[PDB]
């Protein structure tokens, strides 16, 4: 009549957070790019033909990017798959033989590269081979008359060249969840990260995210909505990595106007080293043209998202990076297979107050990189034949602030930070892993039998 009992239901809308293993899915088509392991697509499940979305009526739910422990899972996953695209290719520790160098076969107009001859063990163990290559000033180092050099990993590490078959363009992947877990998605547009969301939504898997190797500029990513949302885990500690999400994208049409020669060298048997041959005649430099007009408008798209952080009438300043490595002072991103570190000196430079052309960004080039900060494991990128070009939508920024400077006069803002679990997290902000608890108790007036 009133003595309420316990009643058992199943399939309830209840959850708590818990970390466990997610897994991959990258279409039924990306498994057909060949090239021997483009990233990780191997036995991953193909992706469903139609992904739909559900908006949770009345749900007010907490979201974050910081202690969202998928920010650690994805970095550890992208780390060990890098070896799997490497271990059946060509290692090159004997390339620590000395090269006799000189400024290149040029008509001056300068060098930054050299014409370096050296001896090497070929297919036959007894036969030695004469061959010279061309390297950038970052791939080698002089050791302590003309100048002679060594490869740069030699005073620290071993090194392995990847297969030139393996291509390296960012290809999308969906992150997955099985029977018991899911991934949340707060469909707020004006979303400053912290708090319950008014119209919480959900997804079973994420959208398509590309693991773009980039510091400073985010590329091939995801846009913002309404106002260019400014995001950060912590805006007070100037040691933290701050991530901006653009709304209006910018065209980067990078170019390496040097028809490059790929000289394959036999030093195996079977294996091969890939040297740099002649560049045809004229001598030009790798840049990265950027629409001057698009930058100036997008500056206001975020600077007017800074007057909402200090003053309805105020002032904002910029200056180039405070210093450090190329990965924190220069926009690094993959272009062709070789790498481009682009000069951020000429961008962070203006001064804001109250009431058709293009600049270009100088870019250095690197082929041997010690990425992941693994002292012991450097690599060599087999050079790209021909002129290199890469169009992409500019998407975000990894940057820092200064300290107090003069308290509230204004503040200088520079690029830096770098860390690779926060380049990833620039595309992990709107998700959080949850464990689903399906059993639910209620008190209804019914009771069972004996």
């Amino acid at each position, epitope marked *: 009549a009133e003595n309420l009992w316990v009643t058992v239901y199943y399939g309830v809308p209840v959850w708590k957070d818990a970390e466990t293993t997610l897994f991959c899915a990258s279409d039924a088509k990306a498994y057909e790019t060949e090239k021997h392991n483009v990233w990780a697509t191997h036995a991953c499940v193909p992706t469903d033909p139609n992904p739909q979305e559900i908006h949770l009526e009345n749900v007010t739910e907490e979201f974050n990017m*910081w*202690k969202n422990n998928m*920010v*650690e899972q994805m*970095h550890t996953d992208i780390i060990s798959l890098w070896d799997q695209s490497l271990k059946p290719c060509v290692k090159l520790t004997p390339l620590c033989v000395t090269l006799q160098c000189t400024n290149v076969t040029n008509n001056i107009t300068d060098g930054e590269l050299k014409n370096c001859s050296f001896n090497m063990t070929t297919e036959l163990r007894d036969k030695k081979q004469k061959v010279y290559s061309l390297f950038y000033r970052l791939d080698v180092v002089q050791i302590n008359s003309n100048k002679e050099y060594r490869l740069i990993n030699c*005073n*620290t*590490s071993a090194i392995t060249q990847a297969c030139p078959k393996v291509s390296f363009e960012p290809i999308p992947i969906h992150y997955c969840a099985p029977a018991g877990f899911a991934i949340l998605k707060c469909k707020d547009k004006k979303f400053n990260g912290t708090g319950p969301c008014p119209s919480v939504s959900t997804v079973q898997c994420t959208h398509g995210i590309k693991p773009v190797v980039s*510091t400073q500029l985010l590329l091939n990513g995801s846009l913002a909505e309404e106002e260019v949302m400014i995001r950060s885990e*912590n805006i007070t*500690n*100037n*040691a*933290k*990595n701050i991530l901006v999400q653009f709304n209006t994208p910018v065209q980067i049409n990078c170019t390496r106007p040097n028809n490059n020669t790929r000289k394959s060298i036999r030093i195996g048997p079977g294996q091969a080293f890939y040297a740099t041959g002649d560049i045809i005649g004229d001598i030009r430099q790798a840049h990265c043209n950027v629409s001057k007009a698009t930058w100036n408008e997008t500056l206001g798209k975020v600077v007017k998202q800074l007057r909402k952080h200090f003053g309805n009438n105020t002032i904002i300043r910029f200056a180039n990076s*405070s*210093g*450090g*490595d*190329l*990965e*924190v002072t220069t926009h690094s991103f993959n272009c062709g297979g070789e790498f481009f570190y682009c000069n951020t000196s000429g961008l962070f430079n203006s001064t804001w107050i109250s009431n058709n052309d293009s600049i270009t960004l100088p870019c250095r080039i690197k082929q041997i990189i*010690n990425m992941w*900060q693994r*002292i012991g494991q450097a690599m060599y990128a087999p050079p790209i034949q021909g002129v290199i070009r890469c169009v992409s939508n500019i998407t975000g920024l990894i940057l*820092t602030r*200064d*300290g*107090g*400077s*003069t*308290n509230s006069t204004t503040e*200088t803002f520079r690029p*830096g*930070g*770098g*860390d690779m*679990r926060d380049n990833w997290r620039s595309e992990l902000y709107k998700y959080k892993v949850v464990k689903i608890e399906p059993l639910g108790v209620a008190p209804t007036r019914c009771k069972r039998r004996v």
Partner: antibody, heavy 125, light 107 residues
Framework: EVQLVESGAQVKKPGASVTVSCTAS????????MHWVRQAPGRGLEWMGWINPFRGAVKYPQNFRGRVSMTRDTSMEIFYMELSRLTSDDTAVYYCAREMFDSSADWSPWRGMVAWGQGTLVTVS | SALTQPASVSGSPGQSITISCAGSSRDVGGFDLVSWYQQHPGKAPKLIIYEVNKRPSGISSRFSASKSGNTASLTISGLQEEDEAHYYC????????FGGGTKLTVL
């Protein structure tokens, strides 16, 4: 054990610069923020700057921008540091110092001075 | 430095001491990020307390300090001749400012 090996006395002259070292030999380099700290003979100390050794994110107070240039060597594991526009007041010793909560994934802070070196004494006229 | 620390403090073995550390509406009174240190005369300096009052693993719990209102202060219980040293105050403020310093000695 760990250590912060510092250079011996490196006396230098005004209008120039000087190099002071903190060799690392026992702990993880990249993930551990490190500060340079200055101590004058019998006076108050000045916080100089710091670095994010993972690719070297350095910062200064506006006090010395244009003067100071500060960095490290990744695989040789050490901190160099220089301060330009020397004046005789700069006669002092120096100390490298680390922060508390450092790791791999989730960061913070900017505090908790634990580490100190050997006191590299330079002298300026 | 930006925190007024007094001139001197001296005593007899066994007593205890208090040292004030005052600023304005910005420094010690403005923020809860302080710390105090010890310098025995001529080696590597050492931290004793961080953040108002939380000891790090190892310091003998005769030392304890705090931050109240605007004047940070400290207290060392049962002075030994081991405690005869120089002492400071830290406080992250905008960047980092400091306390002037105060030495403890045996009378």
């Amino acid at each position: 054990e760990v250590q912060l090996v510092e250079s011996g006395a490196q006396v230098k002259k005004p209008g120039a610069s000087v190099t002071v070292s903190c060799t690392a030999s026992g702990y993880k380099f990249t993930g551990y923020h490190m500060h340079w700290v200055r101590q004058a003979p019998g006076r108050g100390l000045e916080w100089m700057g710091w670095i994010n050794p993972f690719r070297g994110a350095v910062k200064y107070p506006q006090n010395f921008r244009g003067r100071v240039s500060m960095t490290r060597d990744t695989s040789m594991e050490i901190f160099y540091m220089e301060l330009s526009r020397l004046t005789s007041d700069d006669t002092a010793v120096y100390y490298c110092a680390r922060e508390m909560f450092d790791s791999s994934a989730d960061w913070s802070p900017w505090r908790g001075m634990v580490a100190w070196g050997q006191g590299t004494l330079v002298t300026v006229s | 430095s930006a925190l007024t620390q007094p001139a001197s403090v001296s005593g007899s073995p066994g007593q205890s001491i208090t040292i004030s550390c005052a600023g304005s509406s910005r420094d010690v009174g403005g923020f809860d990020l302080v710390s105090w240190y010890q310098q025995h005369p001529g080696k590597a300096p050492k931290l004793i307390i961080y953040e108002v009052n939380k000891r790090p693993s190892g310091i003998s719990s005769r030392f304890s300090a705090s931050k109240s209102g605007n004047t940070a202060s400290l207290t060392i219980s049962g002075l030994q001749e081991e405690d005869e040293a120089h002492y400071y105050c830290y406080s992250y403020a905008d960047g980092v400012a400091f306390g002037g310093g105060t030495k403890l000695t045996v009378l």
